[PDB]
PDB file of C-alpha atoms in Angstrom:
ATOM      1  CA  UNK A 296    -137.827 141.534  96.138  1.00 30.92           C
ATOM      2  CA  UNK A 297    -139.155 139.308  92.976  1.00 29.29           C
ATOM      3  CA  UNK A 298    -138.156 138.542  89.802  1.00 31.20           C
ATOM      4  CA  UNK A 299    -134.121 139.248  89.885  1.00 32.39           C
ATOM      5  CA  UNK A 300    -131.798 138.150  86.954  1.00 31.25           C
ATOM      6  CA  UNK A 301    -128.057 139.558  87.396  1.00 34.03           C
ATOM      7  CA  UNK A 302    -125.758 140.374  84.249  1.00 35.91           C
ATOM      8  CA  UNK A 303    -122.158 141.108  84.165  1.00 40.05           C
ATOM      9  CA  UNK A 304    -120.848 143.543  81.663  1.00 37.65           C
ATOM     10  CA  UNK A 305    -117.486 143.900  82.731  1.00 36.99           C
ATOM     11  CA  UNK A 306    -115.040 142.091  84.770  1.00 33.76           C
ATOM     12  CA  UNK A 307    -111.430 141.783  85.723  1.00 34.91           C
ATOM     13  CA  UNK A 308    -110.071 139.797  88.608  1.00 36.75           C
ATOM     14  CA  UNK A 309    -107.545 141.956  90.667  1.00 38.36           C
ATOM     15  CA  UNK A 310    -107.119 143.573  93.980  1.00 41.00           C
ATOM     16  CA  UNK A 311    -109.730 146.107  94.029  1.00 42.03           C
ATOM     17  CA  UNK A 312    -113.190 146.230  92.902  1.00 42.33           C
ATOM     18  CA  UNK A 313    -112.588 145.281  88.887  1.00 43.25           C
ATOM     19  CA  UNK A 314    -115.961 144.129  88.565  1.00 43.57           C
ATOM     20  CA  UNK A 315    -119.204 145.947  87.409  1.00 41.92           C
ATOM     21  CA  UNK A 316    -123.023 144.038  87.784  1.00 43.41           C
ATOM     22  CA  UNK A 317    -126.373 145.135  86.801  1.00 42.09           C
ATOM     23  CA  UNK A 318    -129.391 143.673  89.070  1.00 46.80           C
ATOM     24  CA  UNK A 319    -132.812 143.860  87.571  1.00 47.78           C
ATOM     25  CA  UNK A 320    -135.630 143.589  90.305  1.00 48.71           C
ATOM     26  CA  UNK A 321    -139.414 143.996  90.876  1.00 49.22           C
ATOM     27  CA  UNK A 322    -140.187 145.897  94.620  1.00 49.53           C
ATOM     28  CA  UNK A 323    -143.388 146.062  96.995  1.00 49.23           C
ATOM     29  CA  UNK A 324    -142.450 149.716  98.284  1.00 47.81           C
ATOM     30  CA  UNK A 325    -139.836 152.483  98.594  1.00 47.26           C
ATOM     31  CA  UNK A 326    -137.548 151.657 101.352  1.00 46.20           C
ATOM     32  CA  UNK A 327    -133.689 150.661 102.107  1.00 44.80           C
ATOM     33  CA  UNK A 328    -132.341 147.465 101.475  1.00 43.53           C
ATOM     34  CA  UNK A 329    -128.846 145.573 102.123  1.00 43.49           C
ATOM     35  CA  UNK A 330    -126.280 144.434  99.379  1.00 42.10           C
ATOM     36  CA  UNK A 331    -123.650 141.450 100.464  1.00 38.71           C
ATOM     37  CA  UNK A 332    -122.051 138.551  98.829  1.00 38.99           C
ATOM     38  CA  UNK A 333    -122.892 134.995  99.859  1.00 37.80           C
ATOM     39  CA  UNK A 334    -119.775 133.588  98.065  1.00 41.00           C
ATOM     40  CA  UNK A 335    -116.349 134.583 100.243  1.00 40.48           C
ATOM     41  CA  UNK A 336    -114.528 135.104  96.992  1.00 41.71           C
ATOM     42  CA  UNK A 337    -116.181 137.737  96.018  1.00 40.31           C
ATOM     43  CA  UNK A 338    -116.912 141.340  98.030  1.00 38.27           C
ATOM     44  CA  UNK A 339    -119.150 144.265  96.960  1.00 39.90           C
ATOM     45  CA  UNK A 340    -118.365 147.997  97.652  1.00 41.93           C
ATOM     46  CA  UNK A 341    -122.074 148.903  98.312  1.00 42.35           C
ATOM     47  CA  UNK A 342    -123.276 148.394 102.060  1.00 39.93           C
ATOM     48  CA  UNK A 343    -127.435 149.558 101.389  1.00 42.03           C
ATOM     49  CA  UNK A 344    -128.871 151.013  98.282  1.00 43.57           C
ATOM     50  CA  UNK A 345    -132.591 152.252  97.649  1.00 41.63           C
ATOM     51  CA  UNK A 346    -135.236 150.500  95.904  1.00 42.73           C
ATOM     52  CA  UNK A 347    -138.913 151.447  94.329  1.00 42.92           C
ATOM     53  CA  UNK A 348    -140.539 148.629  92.125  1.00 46.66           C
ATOM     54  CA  UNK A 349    -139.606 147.822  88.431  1.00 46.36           C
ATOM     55  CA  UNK A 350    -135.894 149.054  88.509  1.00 47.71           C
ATOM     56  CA  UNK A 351    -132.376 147.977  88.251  1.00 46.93           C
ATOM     57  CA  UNK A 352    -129.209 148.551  90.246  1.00 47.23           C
ATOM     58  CA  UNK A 353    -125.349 149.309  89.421  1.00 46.36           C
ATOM     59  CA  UNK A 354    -122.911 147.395  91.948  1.00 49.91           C
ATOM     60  CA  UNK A 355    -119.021 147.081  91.870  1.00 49.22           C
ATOM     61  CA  UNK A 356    -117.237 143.475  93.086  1.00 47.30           C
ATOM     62  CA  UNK A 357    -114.231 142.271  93.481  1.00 46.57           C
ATOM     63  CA  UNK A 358    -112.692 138.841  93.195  1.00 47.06           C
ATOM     64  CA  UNK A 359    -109.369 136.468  92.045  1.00 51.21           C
ATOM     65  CA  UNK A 360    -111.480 133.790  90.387  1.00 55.11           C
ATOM     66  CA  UNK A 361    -111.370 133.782  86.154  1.00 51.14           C
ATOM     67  CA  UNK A 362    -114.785 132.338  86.371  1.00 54.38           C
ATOM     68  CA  UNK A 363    -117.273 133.583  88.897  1.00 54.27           C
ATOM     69  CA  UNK A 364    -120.285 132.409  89.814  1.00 53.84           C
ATOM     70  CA  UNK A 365    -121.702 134.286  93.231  1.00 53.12           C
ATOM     71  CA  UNK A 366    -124.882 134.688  94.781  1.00 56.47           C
ATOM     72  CA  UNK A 367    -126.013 138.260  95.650  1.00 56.22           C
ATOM     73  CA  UNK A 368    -128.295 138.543  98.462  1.00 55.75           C
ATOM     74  CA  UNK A 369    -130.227 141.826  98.005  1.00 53.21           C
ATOM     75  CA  UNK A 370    -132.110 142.783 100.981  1.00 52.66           C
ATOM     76  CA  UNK A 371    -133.991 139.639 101.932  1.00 51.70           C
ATOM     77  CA  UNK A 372    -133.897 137.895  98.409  1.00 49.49           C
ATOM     78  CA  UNK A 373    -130.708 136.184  96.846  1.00 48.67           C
ATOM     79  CA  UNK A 374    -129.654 136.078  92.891  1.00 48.65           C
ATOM     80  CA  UNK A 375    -127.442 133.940  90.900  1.00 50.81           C
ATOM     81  CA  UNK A 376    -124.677 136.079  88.933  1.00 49.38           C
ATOM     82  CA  UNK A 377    -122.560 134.547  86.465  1.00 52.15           C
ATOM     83  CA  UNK A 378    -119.545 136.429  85.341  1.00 54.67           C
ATOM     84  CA  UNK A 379    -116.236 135.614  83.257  1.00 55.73           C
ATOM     85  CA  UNK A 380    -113.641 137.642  84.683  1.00 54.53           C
ATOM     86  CA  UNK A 381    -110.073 138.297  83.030  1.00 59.87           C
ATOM     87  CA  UNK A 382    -106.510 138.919  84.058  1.00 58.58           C
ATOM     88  CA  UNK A 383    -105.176 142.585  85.157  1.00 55.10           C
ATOM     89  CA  UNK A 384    -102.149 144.272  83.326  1.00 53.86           C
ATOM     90  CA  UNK A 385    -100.096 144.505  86.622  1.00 55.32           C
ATOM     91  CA  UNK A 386     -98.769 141.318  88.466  1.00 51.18           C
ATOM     92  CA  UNK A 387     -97.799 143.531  91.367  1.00 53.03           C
ATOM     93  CA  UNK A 388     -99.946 146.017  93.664  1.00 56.73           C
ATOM     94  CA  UNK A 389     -99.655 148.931  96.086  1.00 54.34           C
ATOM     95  CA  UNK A 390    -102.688 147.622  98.188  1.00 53.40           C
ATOM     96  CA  UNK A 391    -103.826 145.007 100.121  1.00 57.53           C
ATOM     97  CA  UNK A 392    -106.917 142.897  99.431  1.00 59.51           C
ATOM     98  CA  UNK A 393    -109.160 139.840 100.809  1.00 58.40           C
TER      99      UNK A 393
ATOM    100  CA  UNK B 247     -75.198 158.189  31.416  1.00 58.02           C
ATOM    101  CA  UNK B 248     -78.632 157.865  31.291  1.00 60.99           C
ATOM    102  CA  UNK B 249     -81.357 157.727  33.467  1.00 63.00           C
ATOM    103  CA  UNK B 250     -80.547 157.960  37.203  1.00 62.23           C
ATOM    104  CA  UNK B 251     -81.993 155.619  40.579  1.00 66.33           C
ATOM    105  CA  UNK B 252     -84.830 158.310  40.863  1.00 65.57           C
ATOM    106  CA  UNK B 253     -86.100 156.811  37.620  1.00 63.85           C
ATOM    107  CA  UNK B 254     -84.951 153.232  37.485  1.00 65.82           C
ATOM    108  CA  UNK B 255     -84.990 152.139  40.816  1.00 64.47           C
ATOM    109  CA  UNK B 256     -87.624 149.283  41.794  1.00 62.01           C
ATOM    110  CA  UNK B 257     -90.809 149.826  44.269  1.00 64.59           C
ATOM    111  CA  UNK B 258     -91.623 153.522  43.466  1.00 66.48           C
ATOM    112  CA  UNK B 259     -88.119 155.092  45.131  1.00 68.64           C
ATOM    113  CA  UNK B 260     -87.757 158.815  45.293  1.00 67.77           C
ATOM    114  CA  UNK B 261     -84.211 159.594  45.643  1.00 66.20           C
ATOM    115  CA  UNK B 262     -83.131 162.560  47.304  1.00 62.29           C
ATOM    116  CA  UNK B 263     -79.505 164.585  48.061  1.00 57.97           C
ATOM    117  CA  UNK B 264     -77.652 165.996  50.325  1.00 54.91           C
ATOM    118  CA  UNK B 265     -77.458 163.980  52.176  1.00 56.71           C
ATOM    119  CA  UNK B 266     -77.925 160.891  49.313  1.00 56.70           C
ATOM    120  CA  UNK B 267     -81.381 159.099  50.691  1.00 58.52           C
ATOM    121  CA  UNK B 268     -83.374 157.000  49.600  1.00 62.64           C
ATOM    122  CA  UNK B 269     -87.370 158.293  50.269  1.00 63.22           C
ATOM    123  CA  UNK B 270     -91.224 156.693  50.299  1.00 64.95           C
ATOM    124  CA  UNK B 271     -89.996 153.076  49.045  1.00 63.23           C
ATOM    125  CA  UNK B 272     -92.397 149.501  49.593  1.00 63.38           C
ATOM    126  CA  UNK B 273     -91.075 146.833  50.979  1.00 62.27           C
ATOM    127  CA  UNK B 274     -91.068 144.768  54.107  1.00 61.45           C
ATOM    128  CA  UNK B 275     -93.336 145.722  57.871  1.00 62.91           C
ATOM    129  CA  UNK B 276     -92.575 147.857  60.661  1.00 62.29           C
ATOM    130  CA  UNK B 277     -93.566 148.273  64.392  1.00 62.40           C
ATOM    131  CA  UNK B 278     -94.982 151.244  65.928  1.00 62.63           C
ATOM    132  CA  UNK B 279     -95.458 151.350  69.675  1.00 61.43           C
ATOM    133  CA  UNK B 280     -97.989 153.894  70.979  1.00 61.90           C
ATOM    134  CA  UNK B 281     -97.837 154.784  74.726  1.00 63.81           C
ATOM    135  CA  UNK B 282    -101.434 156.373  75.193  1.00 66.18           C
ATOM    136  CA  UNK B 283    -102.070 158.142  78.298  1.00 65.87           C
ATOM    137  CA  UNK B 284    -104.658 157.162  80.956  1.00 64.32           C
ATOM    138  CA  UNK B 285    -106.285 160.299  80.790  1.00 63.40           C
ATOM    139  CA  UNK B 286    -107.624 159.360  77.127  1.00 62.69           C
ATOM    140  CA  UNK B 287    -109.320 156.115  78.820  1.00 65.28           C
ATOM    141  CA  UNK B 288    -112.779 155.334  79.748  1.00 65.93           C
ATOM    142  CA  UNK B 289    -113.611 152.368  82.064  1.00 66.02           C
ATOM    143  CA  UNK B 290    -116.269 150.007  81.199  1.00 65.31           C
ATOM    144  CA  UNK B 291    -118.513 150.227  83.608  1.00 63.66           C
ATOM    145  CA  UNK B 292    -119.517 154.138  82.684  1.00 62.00           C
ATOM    146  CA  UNK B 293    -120.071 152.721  79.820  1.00 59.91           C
ATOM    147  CA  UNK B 294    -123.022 150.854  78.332  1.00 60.63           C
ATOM    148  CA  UNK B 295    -124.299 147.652  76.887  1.00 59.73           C
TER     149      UNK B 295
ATOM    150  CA  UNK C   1    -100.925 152.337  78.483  1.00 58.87           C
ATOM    151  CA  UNK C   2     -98.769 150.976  76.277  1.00 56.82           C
ATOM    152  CA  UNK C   3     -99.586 149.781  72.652  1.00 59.20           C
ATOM    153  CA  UNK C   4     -97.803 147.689  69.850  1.00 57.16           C
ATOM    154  CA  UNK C   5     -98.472 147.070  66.817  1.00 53.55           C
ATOM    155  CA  UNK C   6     -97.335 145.749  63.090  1.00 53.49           C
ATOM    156  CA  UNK C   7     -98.139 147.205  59.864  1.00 54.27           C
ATOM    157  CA  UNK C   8     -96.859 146.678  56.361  1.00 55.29           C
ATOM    158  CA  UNK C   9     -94.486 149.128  54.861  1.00 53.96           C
ATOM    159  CA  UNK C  10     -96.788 150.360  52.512  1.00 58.62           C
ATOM    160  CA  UNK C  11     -97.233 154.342  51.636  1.00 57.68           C
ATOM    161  CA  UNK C  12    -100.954 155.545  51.196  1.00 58.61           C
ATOM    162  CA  UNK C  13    -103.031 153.014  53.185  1.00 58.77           C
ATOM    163  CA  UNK C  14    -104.856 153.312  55.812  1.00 60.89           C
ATOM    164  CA  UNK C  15    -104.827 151.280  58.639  1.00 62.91           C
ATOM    165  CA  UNK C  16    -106.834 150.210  61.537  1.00 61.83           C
ATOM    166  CA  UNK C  17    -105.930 149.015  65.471  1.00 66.54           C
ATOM    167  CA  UNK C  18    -107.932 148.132  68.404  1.00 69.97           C
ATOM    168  CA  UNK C  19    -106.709 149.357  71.597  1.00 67.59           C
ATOM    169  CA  UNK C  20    -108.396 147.056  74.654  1.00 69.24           C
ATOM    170  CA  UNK C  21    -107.163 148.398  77.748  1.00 68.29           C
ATOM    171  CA  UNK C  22    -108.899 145.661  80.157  1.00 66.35           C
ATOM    172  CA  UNK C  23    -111.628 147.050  82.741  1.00 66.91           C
ATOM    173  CA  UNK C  24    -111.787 149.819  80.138  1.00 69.03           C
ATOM    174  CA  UNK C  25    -113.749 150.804  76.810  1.00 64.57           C
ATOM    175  CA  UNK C  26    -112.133 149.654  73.754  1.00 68.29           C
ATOM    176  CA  UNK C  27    -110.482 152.430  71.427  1.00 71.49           C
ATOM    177  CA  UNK C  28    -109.431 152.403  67.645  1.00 71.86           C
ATOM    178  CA  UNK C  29    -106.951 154.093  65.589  1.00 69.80           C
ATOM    179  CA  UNK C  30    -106.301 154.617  62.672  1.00 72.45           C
ATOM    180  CA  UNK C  31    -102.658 154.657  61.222  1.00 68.54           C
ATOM    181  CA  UNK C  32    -101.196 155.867  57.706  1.00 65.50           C
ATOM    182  CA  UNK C  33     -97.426 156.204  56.269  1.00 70.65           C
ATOM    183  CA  UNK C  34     -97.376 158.838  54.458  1.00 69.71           C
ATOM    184  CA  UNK C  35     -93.170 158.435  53.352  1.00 66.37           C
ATOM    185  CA  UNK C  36     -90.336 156.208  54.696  1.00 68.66           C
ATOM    186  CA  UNK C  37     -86.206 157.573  54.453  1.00 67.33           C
ATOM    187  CA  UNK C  38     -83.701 154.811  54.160  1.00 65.62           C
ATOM    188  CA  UNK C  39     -79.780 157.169  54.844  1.00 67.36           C
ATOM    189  CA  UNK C  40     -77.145 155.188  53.592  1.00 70.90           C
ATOM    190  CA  UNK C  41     -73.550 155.378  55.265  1.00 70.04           C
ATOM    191  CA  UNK C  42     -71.434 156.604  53.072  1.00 71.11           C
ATOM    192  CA  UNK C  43     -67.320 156.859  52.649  1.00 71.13           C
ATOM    193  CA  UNK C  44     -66.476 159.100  49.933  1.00 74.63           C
ATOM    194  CA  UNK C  45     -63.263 157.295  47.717  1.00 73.66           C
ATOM    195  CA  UNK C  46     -62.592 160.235  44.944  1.00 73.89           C
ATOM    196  CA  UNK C  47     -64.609 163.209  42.801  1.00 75.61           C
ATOM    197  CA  UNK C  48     -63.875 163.607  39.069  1.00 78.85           C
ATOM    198  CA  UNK C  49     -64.340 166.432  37.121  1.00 79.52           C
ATOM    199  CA  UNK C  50     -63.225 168.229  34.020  1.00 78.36           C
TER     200      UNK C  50
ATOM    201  CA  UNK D   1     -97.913 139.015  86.283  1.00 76.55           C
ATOM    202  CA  UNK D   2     -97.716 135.831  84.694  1.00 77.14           C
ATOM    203  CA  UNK D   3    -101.020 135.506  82.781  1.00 77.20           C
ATOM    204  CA  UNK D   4    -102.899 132.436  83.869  1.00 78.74           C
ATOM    205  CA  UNK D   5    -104.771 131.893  80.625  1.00 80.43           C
ATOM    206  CA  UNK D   6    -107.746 129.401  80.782  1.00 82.89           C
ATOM    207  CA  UNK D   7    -107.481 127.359  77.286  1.00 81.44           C
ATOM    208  CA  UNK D   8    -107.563 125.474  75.037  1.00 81.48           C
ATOM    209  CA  UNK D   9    -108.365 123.110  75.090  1.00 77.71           C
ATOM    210  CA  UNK D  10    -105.667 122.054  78.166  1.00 75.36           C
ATOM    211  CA  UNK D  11    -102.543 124.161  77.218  1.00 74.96           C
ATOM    212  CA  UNK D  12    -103.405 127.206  79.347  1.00 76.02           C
ATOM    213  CA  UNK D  13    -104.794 124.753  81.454  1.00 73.98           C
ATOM    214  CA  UNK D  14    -100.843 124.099  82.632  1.00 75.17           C
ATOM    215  CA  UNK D  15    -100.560 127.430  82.068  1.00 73.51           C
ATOM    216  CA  UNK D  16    -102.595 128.593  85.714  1.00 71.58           C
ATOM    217  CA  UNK D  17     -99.309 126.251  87.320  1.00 75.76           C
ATOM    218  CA  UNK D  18     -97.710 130.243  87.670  1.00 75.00           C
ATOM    219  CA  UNK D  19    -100.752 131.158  88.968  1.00 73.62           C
ATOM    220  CA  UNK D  20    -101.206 130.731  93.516  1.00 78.26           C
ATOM    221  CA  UNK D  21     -98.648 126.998  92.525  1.00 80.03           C
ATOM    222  CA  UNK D  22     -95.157 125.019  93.829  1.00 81.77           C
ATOM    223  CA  UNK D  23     -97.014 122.059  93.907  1.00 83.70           C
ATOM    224  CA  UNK D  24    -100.545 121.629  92.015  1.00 80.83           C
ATOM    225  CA  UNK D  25     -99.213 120.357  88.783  1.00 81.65           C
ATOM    226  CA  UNK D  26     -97.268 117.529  90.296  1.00 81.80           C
ATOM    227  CA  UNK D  27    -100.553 116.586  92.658  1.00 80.15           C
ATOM    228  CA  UNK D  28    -102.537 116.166  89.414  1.00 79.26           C
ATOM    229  CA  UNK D  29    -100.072 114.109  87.792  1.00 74.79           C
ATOM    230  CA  UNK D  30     -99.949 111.690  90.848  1.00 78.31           C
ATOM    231  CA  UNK D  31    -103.844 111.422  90.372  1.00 78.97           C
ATOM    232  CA  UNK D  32    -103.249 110.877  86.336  1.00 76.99           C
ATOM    233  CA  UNK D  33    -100.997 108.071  86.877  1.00 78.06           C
ATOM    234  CA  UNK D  34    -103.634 106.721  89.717  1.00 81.41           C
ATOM    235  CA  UNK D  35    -106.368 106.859  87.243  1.00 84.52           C
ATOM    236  CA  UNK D  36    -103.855 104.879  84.749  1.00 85.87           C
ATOM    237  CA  UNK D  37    -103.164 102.434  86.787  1.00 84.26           C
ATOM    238  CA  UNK D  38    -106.990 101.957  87.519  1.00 82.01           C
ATOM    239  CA  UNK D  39    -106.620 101.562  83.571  1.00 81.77           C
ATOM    240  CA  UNK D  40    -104.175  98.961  83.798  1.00 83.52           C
ATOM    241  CA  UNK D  41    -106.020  96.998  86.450  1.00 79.95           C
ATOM    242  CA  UNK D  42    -109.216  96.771  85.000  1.00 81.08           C
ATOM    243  CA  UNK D  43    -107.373  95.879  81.353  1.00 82.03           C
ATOM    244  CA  UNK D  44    -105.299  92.932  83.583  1.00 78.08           C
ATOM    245  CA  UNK D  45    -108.855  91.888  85.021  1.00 80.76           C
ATOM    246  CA  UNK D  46    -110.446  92.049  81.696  1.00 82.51           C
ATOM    247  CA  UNK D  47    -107.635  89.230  79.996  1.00 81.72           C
ATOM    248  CA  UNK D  48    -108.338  86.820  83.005  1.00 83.15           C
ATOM    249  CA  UNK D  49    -112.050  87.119  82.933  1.00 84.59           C
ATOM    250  CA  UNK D  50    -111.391  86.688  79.132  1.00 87.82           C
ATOM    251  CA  UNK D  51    -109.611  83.238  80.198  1.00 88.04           C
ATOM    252  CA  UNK D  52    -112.647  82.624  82.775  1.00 85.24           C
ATOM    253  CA  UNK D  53    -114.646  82.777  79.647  1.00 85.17           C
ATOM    254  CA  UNK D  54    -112.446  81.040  77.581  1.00 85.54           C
ATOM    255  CA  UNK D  55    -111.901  78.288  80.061  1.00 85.68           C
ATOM    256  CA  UNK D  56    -114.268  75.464  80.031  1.00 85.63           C
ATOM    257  CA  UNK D  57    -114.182  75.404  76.238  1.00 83.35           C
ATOM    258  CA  UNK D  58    -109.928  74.635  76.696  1.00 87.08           C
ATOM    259  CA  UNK D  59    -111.115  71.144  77.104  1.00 85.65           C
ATOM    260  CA  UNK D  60    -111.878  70.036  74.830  1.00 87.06           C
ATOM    261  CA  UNK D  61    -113.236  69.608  70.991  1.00 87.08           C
ATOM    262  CA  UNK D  62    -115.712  70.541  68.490  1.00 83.94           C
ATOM    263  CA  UNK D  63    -117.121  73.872  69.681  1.00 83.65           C
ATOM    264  CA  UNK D  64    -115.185  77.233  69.017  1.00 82.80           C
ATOM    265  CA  UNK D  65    -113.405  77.853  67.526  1.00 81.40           C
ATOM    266  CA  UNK D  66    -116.836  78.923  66.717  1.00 80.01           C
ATOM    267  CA  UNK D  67    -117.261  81.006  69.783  1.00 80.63           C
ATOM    268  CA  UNK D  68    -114.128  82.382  68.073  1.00 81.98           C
ATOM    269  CA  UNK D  69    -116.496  84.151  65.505  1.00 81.68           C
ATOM    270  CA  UNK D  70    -118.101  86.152  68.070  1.00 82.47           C
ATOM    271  CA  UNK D  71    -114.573  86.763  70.019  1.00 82.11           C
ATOM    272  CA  UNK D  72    -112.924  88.821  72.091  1.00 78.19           C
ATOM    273  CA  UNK D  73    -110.239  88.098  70.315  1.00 83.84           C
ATOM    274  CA  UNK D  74    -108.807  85.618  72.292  1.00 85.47           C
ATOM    275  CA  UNK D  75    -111.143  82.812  70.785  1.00 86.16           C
ATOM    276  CA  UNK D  76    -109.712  84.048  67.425  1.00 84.77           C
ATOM    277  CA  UNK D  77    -106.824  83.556  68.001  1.00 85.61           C
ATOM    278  CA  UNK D  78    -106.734  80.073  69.771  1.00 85.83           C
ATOM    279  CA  UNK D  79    -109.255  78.940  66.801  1.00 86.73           C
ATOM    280  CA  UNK D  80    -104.690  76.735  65.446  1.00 87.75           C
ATOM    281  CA  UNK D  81    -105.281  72.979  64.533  1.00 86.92           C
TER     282      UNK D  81
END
């Protein structure tokens, strides 16, 4: 994995996965690769995706942080995501969470 | 006895009977809460930028 | 999801709200009086006639 | 519940006291008054090394005044007389 950059669209700190990042990449070959959070604040819902070459990927997080600024390690390769994250509408939940 | 509130009275007032009412007249705000249903939401993310 | 707003009591204008519903995609609508009835409570004292 | 807004500037800073708390606010304020008494001390020092400098010259004659003014004040104000 080469040239990664990570933008946040959408974010909101709660319980369950309230985030949404975009990864933009550059891959040698086809093949499977694994998705996890450095940072323990934050958690992603994807376990493996597939990558090609020139691409991009979709990934869900979730976190309690306002501002969020986690590293993304993406098969062997890490990137830098920066996100601003904002309050939910409900102060209580029916689920547990990290 | 002249001209009646339908004609005189200030900020455009139409006044209707039966019952005695006073309709359409200017003056001062008013709230309006709208409880829209989830099912007319879209999330972000299938969204795009 | 519930909305409030404030608009002025004005008949024949058009006006515009934006509905941000976090974690989803912002919505607008738009919002005109056409008439506002103000009922009076009444207590009748007497009737005249001829 | 309770929104935990960011800014600003400081108001929602106090704000995030709701938010994860009991406790927090008062820690901070314990450091504030730390960092004004480091404020305090260094403002004490400052008038006695002001007397170090203005010693010497407290005896005694023709020569600062001057000093003075350049003086910090005090130089002046003994410079009277």
């Amino acid at each position: 994995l080469t040239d990664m950059s990570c933008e946040v669209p959408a974010c909101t700190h709660s319980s369950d996965f309230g985030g949404v990042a975009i990864i933009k990449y550059a891959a040698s070959k086809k093949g499977k690769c694994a998705v996890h959070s450095m940072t323990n604040a934050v958690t992603i819902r994807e376990a493996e995706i597939e990558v090609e070459g020139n691409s991009q990927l979709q990934i869900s997080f979730s976190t309690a942080l306002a501002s969020a600024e986690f590293r993304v390690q993406v098969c062997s390769t890490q990137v830098h995501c920066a996100a601003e994250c904002h309050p939910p509408k409900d102060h209580i939940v029916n689920y547990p969470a990290s | 006895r002249g001209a009646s509130l339908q004609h005189t009275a200030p900020f455009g007032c139409q006044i209707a009977t039966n019952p005695v009412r006073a309709v359409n007249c200017a003056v001062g705000n008013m709230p309006i809460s709208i409880d829209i249903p989830e099912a007319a939401f879209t999330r972000v993310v299938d969204a795009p930028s | 999801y519930e909305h409030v707003t404030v608009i002025p009591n004005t008949v024949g204008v058009p006006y515009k709200t934006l509905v941000n519903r976090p974690g989803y995609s912002p919505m607008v609508l738009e919002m005109e009086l056409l008439s506002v009835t103000l009922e009076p409570t009444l207590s009748l004292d007497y009737i005249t006639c001829e | 519940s309770t929104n935990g807004t960011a800014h600003g500037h400081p108001h929602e800073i106090i704000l995030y006291y709701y938010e994860l708390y009991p406790t927090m606010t008062v820690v901070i304020v314990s450091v504030a008054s730390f960092v004004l008494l480091s404020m305090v001390g260094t403002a004490v020092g400052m008038c006695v090394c002001a007397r170090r400098r203005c010693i010497t010259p407290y005896e005694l004659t023709p020569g600062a005044t001057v000093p003075f003014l350049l003086s910090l004040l005090c130089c002046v104000r003994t410079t009277k007389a």
